[PDB]
């Protein structure tokens, strides 16, 4: 499933893993 596995994924890249 893709909001499950990529759900929590989604989440650690937009905030920390990442920084815009």
Same mark, same amino acid.
């Given at each position: +499933?893709?909001?499950?596995?990529?759900?929590?994924?989604?989440?650690?890249?937009? +905030? /920390?893993?990442? /920084?815009?």
């Amino acid at each position: +499933g893709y909001s499950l596995f990529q759900k929590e994924k989604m989440v650690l890249n937009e +905030g /920390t893993s990442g /920084t815009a």
